[PDB]
Amino acid sequence: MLICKVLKPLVSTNRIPGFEHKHLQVVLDGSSNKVAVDAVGCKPGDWVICVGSSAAREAAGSKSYPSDLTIVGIIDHWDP
């Protein structure tokens, strides 16, 4: 899955399905920026793990959920 260091939070905007979007967080995979829904914890961010694809939908909570990438877990011992 995408290794991903949390970078910063987001701000709301004029979309309707944000009821389930649940505070998107800008993360980084080591190359550039990205944003994924925070499921469990983002913090400043040491090292967490991010899941996308269609799994993201049921990874975020719904089959019809509109996402391409969701954070799924935290790596306690992280990785350099």
């Binding site: 979309r15 309707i16 399905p17």
Partner: protein
Amino acid sequence: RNPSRAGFMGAMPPVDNKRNDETEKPDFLITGSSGNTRDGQLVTFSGGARG
């Protein structure tokens, strides 16, 4: 042991669930209310009357 007393006749106090009223529908989201769906106050006709 020590002679207590019963009295009361009505046991526990009648505590009411402060949550009530309801009746009408919560005011078009954006101010309270969880769960739900609709729209992020989108430009869609719904917008205000999002319901």
